[PDB]
Write a protein that binds this DNA or RNA. Sequence first.
DNA 1: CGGCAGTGAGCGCAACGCAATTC
DNA 2: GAATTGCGTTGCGCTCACTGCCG
Lengths: 62, 62
Amino acid sequence: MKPVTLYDVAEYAGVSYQTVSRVVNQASHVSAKTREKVEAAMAELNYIPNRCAQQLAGKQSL
Amino acid sequence: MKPVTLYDVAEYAGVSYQTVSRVVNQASHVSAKTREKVEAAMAELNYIPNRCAQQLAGKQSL
DNA sequence: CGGCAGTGAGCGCAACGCAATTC
DNA sequence: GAATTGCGTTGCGCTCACTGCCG
């Protein structure tokens, strides 16, 4: 009925959303405490980068 | 890559971006004389009406 | 006044930047 | 002392749909 959404992982992790997807995107100065939770959320809901809102968001390819 | 979307094909045909997409969704009364014209222009300019954008667009599923 | 096109807005993830604050 | 948090949006194509543009 309903697939996965980044917003779900954000709320499950209890973080500012940005910190979640940045771990699989380009995490740099993220505290171990912060990544600890977001990893749990990403693995819990199974976060798969879908090809839809990626091209549209303004990627290097439409 | 060239960001030629329904916005660029509009001016090229002398219309808006709705006449262009008109044939992509249903292809109803497209001016009656510009139905095949836009379709041809699409193939000519190698215009690609996305792949997943039209899905998240006009969802109306909520 | 009537046909038929055009604009408007929303959906989703992704990214920028410098200093104060917390660990 | 050095890590680390953030903010908050747009915005893009693309859709529908009603309403206005041009006649």
